[PDB]
Design a protein around this nucleic acid. Structure first.
Ligand SMILES: Nc1nc2c(ncn2[C@@H]2O[C@H](COP(=O)(O)OP(=O)(O)CP(=O)(O)O)[C@@H](O)[C@H]2O)c(=O)[nH]1
Ligand SMILES: *C(=O)[C@@H](N)CCCC[NH3+]
Lengths: 205, 82, 392, 61, 85
RNA sequence: AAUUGAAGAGUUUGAUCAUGGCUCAGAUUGAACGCUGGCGGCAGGCCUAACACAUGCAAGUCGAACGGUAACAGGAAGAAGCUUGCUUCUUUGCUGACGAGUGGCGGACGGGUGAGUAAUGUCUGGGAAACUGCCUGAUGGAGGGGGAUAACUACUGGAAACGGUAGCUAAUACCGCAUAACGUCGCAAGACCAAAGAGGGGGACCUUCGGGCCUCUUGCCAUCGGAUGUGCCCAGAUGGGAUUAGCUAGUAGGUGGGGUAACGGCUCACCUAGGCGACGAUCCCUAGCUGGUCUGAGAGGAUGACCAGCCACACUGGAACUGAGACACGGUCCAGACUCCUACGGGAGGCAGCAGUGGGGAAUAUUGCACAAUGGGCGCAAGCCUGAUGCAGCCAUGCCGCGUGUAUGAAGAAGGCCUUCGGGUUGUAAAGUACUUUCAGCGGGGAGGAAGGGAGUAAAGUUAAUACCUUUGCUCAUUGACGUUACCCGCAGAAGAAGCACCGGCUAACUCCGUGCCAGCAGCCGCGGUAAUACGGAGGGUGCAAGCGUUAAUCGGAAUUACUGGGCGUAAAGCGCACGCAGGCGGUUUGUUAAGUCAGAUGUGAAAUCCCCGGGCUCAACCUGGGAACUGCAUCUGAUACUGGCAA
RNA sequence: GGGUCGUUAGCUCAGUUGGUAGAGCAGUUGACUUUUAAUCAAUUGGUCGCAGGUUCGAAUCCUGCACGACCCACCA
């Protein structure tokens, strides 16, 4: 399921950090960043067409921690939707419960956010969900099932989470520590550094 | 003989009895003249969980379609006045 | 399948052994003949036992036949043992299934070497309960001959470690016992009296996990693979799944029917001679030697450490010496796998008549357990006595 | 007729085996292979890579 | 085969000796009409038909005949004799 | 809202551009094999032998049709001990009820297989010469008699199987008579045909004290129907081969007789001499068919295991009976083969029903539970049967979801590995450390699937009745295979859960050593003859994930069978040339016809499945509502330019 | 489960009164040739399947055990 291995190796592999090692000390730097993905990280790749298509696909998938067989379902799901599949996919790659939990500020990392969902730590609209891949609808209310409220982690997460960019399509209580989700995601408010047209070619072949 | 009975569709442990009019001797999920409404044993508290057009039933009753008990119980459940 | 079996009275696996051709088939036929008048389950004829083709081809017991009977007090799952030299190896499976060995030797024949082969194997497998039956006694009405042969028996029982100081001897004749002539059937009744006399009720090893060395497996019509054999220790019941340990790499097998003498046993138990149907297994894989163990209880050992007594020429074995590297077959409660004599440092030669000890190099990875006393043969002849010290 | 993969089998005169597809295209005329790890045919001894093929189990110790 | 419906196995055998017997006289009365038709006697068949007409429809309701074959038996045979008489 | 949808590359040569094969990159599956493996949800699970089968079970029900009671339990005439009413007990069908038998009904259903079948089948839409148990609407009858037999007894053949004869006796069994209609024959008149009683309760009157009798429920018989199902027919569509070109004699049609439920060469008699066929007859091979599934942008191609319908079969071949209906899976008869039993005289057996066995094979599972729920069978009901079904078990076979932890962490360790031995890399990775516990494991709670039905009772109908029965509530006890359930609570503590393939290019990601055209690799081109990124190992890295690879088969890529959407001067391909039948295409003008054509509508295109738009499962898979679609086909009504037919 | 016949350098297969086992195909060792074929000689090579025993001595016989291709099986 989850990568659960050296989660910063991918940072050197994709150059741009993937916010995997966000946690507390945002000051990454402890991996000889950008120059040593492996024993031969000194070579320079010619990185062909199929290469740039794949490297992006991994970068996107590796940021949200999705798996290929499911991610393939996400493509066809984005394709069956009306409108541009590109934006249709970015929605699906954002509406993930744990990701929504992260986006609220409930979480130091995107993966730690999944640990909450796994451990029943969440209750949304009166329902406790274990499904990390939960497709949270626009304008719902994600909260914490009391047994896991501010248990040394939620506060630890929101502490650094106040220095977060704080997305626009959502709100947070922060008093009772409850996520107040709002409208759906939109291209401008989200990413804007990744490239969506690359992956659509990836599944075309 | 033609009878009005359920058809038991759905899946394991989450049945969905399909009330339908069939040639009595045929299979449970076998052939039928035509379907009419349905029944859901697990949608008790939601928008629906029990649909049925009592009009077409009466049309067939006039032909002799012997209603099976569980379905007959449904006509009382869709209340003769409610 | 038919007839739901009831565990009425305690079983005592008995059998007929001794030098080849002393009357053990007619005797076994006569044993059932006796109780036919008093007890229901008995009365098995000569041809009722002699059903095997080659066993018929000689008129002697070669294939290990089986019968059922019992006294008005305790049960007896009898073993019609073979006496022919080749099949003496096959009587060991029955000897290592037997609770009580009845030394069947005629008074007009005398304790022979083939008789002493069955004798060393008896103690070296685990049998202490022994009564003796002398046959063909109608021939020599010379009682002087009887008291020297009786002497030989108590000496020989002492010779290969059996309680000859407490062994009843029955100077009978089983042929006239099968003739219907009650007198010699009464001579059998004399031993029938001893039948409840010398042998008490042993221990049922039910408490410990299931365990069972395989005796017989057949291509049962309409059921498939049914394994038979007396339970080592532990119990079973229809619906539980045990593991097949043995020479092969260990895996599962389910109890899909347990029976006893074509009579439906409801639940298996230690000691009781059971016939059990197994799920999934086929005739090919399973055979004698392996073990039906309650899952994960036995390490598939490769080698072990033990001591081996060596018979001299007159003792029935080695008429000339040997040494380190020697390859005999060690019989583990039902098996016949080569346990090569690998004497550590120094001991590089063994003469006939020694109790040499060595860490063995077994050929096959068999289900091993420390402390097992095993009887050894080599090249068509017995070489002595053995006892497991350690296991690798 | 089929090719025998690896650097050493233990087959002879009989030793029943299993056949999978594929031609070697090197010693033409042979369009079949043999399965190492199948029946009497054991697996290639001392294999530490690509042991999915050649029927080699994981090194225990 | 073992089945309590072996009664149905022997009842069929029981009813068939009866049924064949019924059809036996019936077909012969039809043959009694043709004998008259092969005789040309306008009265004979008319007597024979008046004899078989009540004995034939009597079989129709009994389940022996499907009443249409019986109707045909009444029909053409009469259609033969009225055309002849 | 309901198809917003289509990629290439490596390989001929010294090199290039063509045509051209070839092979991989994608997806898929009843899959199998190998390495490997924690759990759960939901599906699938003998395509090879349509090979042969031990065991159990898979179809019985009604005492409210009848004679009877052999069992079990009561009442009772009587009985036996002795605590004379505590027990015992020979008789008795008087009851509750019930073996065996008569009979009504069902066994023609459900279930399984795909051998056969190239058209006696199916799909589609029409058609007339049909029948139709049970259900249901209407109109009427429902009188009165007789003769047998099973069971039961006696004797008796026989190893058994399985009978034979002589007596007993009933009915909704069977057969006469009466009476018959809009019923059947006939133009008509006439002629002629049916049957059955039981059960609950009951005041009066009446009791040869069986009951007559009253009342209601149910059933019977006949006619017309409808509904339903089935039979039958027409046209079209429905694999490959022309190295199969003539096929056939009940064959093609008429007439008369007969026959089927119904028309018909379905079958006969005689006459006529036809009928089919290159828009493929007959013959040979294969193969169930469609809805659908995989794939494909689409068109098409391949295919059609599962789920549903239709067809066909039941060891092999054929026949017929009972019956509404089979010319029949667990029915009968014959003949054969394969097996079993035997007293060897003679009989018995059919897993292609669910499990299971041997066997075949690369390979695919338990001789489990319950009738709790749906359905079906019989029954008034209660119930009883149900290997249909609902469930559990086994398999990673597929689809999907979750977990194997999070965070902090530089001596930037140990050791592995390369080294310009400076060092780099492994590697925030680990240890240490602060938290956390999902799923399992162990200890307790606890949904919903359950509607009914039972009994008692109230009230509205019923009726002479406050009795019975019917309809609607109330009440108590409760009825669950799964089930140590889903879910909830709590407990120890990161503790128990990540491997597999590849790294020359194709195609993501590299080095050092070992081996030297040897050993080996491989899908393709091709690598190895001493310094290999192509072999074998190690480290690193990449892909994917409870799976990862390989082989198999299908389509795509393949515009390398091209309708969409290809070519022939030389690459493969113009017949050597010409005339010419059928077939194909046809100037121009007006009119008409409306076959093609297009519009609109109607019926239909079964559902499920595919698509859109919602909902319920913690989510998803899945289930599921409504819509859309099923690109089609037949009819009716319009336009009638274009093409076709006709006239000039 | 039982009873008859089998196993030869690294490989195909020999050797009957039991007297100390053979080539052919691999290579290695030098010239030739880009490196091979052709061309040449020297040459190791079985532990006569594994174990003991009979004999002074075993490829030879005594059985057994691993593992084959044959004949009966047995039938909880
Ligand atoms: N005089 C006498 N002769 C007898 C007696 N018993 C048997 N015999 C005969 O001895 C022979 C052996 O019979 P059997 O019963 O097979 O012997 P066994 O002892 O089983 C032989 P195996 O050694 O093969 O198992 C037969 O000939 C039998 O008739 C007896 O008591 N007395
Ligand atoms: C078969 O008879 C067994 N169940 C009983 C014990 C004898 C085993 N050989």
């Amino acid at each position: 399921a989850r990568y659960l291995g050296p989660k910063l190796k991918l940072s050197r592999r994709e150059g741009t950090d993937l916010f995997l090692k966000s946690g507390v000390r945002a000051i990454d730097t402890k991996c000889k960043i950008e120059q040593a993905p492996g024993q031969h990280g000194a070579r320079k790749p010619r990185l062909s067409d199929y290469g740039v298509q794949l490297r992006e696909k991994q970068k996107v998938r590796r940021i949200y921690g999705v798996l290929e067989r499911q991610f393939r379902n996400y493509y066809k799901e984005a394709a069956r939707l009306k409108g541009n599949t590109g934006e249709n996919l970015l929605a699906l790659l954002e509406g993930r419960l744990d990701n929504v939990v992260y986006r609220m500020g409930f979480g130091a990392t995107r993966a730690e956010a999944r640990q909450l969902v796994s451990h029943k730590a969440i209750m949304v609209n009166g329902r406790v969900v274990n499904i990390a891949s939960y497709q949270v609808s626009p304008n719902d209310v994600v909260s914490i099932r009391e047994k896991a409220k501010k248990q040394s982690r939620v506060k630890a997460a929101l502490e650094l989470a106040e220095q977060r960019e704080k997305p626009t399509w959502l709100e947070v209580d922060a008093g009772k520590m409850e996520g107040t989700f709002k409208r759906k995601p939109e291209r401008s408010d989200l990413s804007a550094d990744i490239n969506e047209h690359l992956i659509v070619e990836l599944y075309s072949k | 003989m033609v009878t009005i009975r359920l058809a038991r569709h759905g899946a394991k442990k989450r049945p969905f009895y399909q009330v339908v009019v069939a040639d009595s001797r045929n299979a449970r999920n076998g052939r039928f003249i035509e379907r009419v409404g349905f029944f859901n044993p697990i949608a008790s508290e939601k928008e629906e969980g029990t649909r049925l057009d009592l009009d077409r039933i009466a049309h067939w009753v006039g032909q002799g379609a012997t209603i099976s008990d569980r379905v007959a119980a449904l006509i009382k459940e869709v209340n003769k006045a409610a | 399948s038919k007839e739901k079996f009831e565990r009425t009275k305690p079983h005592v696996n008995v059998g007929t052994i001794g030098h080849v051709d002393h009357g053990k088939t007619t005797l076994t036929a006569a044993i059932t003949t006796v109780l036919a008048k008093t007890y229901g389950g008995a009365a098995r004829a000569f041809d009722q036992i002699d059903n095997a083709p080659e066993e018929k081809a000689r008129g002697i017991t070669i294939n290990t036949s089986h019968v059922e009977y019992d006294t008005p007090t305790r049960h007896y799952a009898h073993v019609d043992c073979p006496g022919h030299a080749d099949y003496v190896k096959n009587m060991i499976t029955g000897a290592a299934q037997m609770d009580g060995a009845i030394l069947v030797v005629a008074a007009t024949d005398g304790p022979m070497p083939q008789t002493r082969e069955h004798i060393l194997l008896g103690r070296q497998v685990g049998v202490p309960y022994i009564i003796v039956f002398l046959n063909k006694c109608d021939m020599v009405d010379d009682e002087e001959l009887l008291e020297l042969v009786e002497m030989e028996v108590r000496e020989l029982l002492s010779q290969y470690d059996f309680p000859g100081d407490d062994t009843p001897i029955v100077r009978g004749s089983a042929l006239k016992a099968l003739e219907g002539d009650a007198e010699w059937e009464a001579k059998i009744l004399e031993l029938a009296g001893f039948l409840d006399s010398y042998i008490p009720e042993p221990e049922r090893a039910i408490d410990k996990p299931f365990l069972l060395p395989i005796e017989d497996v057949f291509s049962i019509s309409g059921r498939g693979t049914v394994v038979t054999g007396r339970v080592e220790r532990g119990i079973i019941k229809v619906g539980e799944e045990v593991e097949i340990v043995g020479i092969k790499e260990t895996q599962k097998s389910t109890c899909t029917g347990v029976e006893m003498f074509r009579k439906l046993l409801d639940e298996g138990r230690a000691g009781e001679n059971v016939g059990v149907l197994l799920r999934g297994i086929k005739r090919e894989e399973i055979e004698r030697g392996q073990v039906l163990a309650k899952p994960g209880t036995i390490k598939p050992h490769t080698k072990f450490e033990s001591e081996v007594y060596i018979l001299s020429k007159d003792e029935g074995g080695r008429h000339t010496p040997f040494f380190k590297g020697y390859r005999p077959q060690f019989y583990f409660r039902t098996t016949d796998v080569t346990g090569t004599i690998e004497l550590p440092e120094g001991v590089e030669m063994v003469m006939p008549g020694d109790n040499i000890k060595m860490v063995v190099t077994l050929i096959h990875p068999i289900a091993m357990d420390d402390g097992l006393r095993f009887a050894i043969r080599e090249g068509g002849r017995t070489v002595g006595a053995g006892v497991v010290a350690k296991v690798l | 007729t089929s090719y025998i993969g690896g650097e050493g089998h233990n087959l002879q005169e009989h030793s029943v085996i299993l056949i999978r597809g594929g031609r070697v295209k090197d010693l033409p005329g042979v369009r079949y292979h043999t399965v190492r790890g199948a029946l009497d045919c054991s697996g290639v001894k001392d294999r530490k890579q690509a042991r999915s093929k050649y029927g080699v189990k994981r090194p225990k110790a | 085969n073992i089945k309590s419906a072996k009664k149905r196995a022997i009842q069929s055998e029981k009813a068939r000796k009866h049924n064949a017997s019924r059809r036996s006289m019936m077909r012969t009365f039809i043959k009694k009409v043709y004998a008259a038709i092969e005789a040309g006697d306008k009265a004979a068949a008319q007597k024979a038909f008046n004899e078989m007409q009540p004995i034939v429809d009597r079989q129709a309701a009994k389940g022996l005949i499907h009443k249409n074959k019986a109707a045909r038996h009444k029909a053409n045979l009469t259609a033969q004799i009225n055309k002849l008489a």
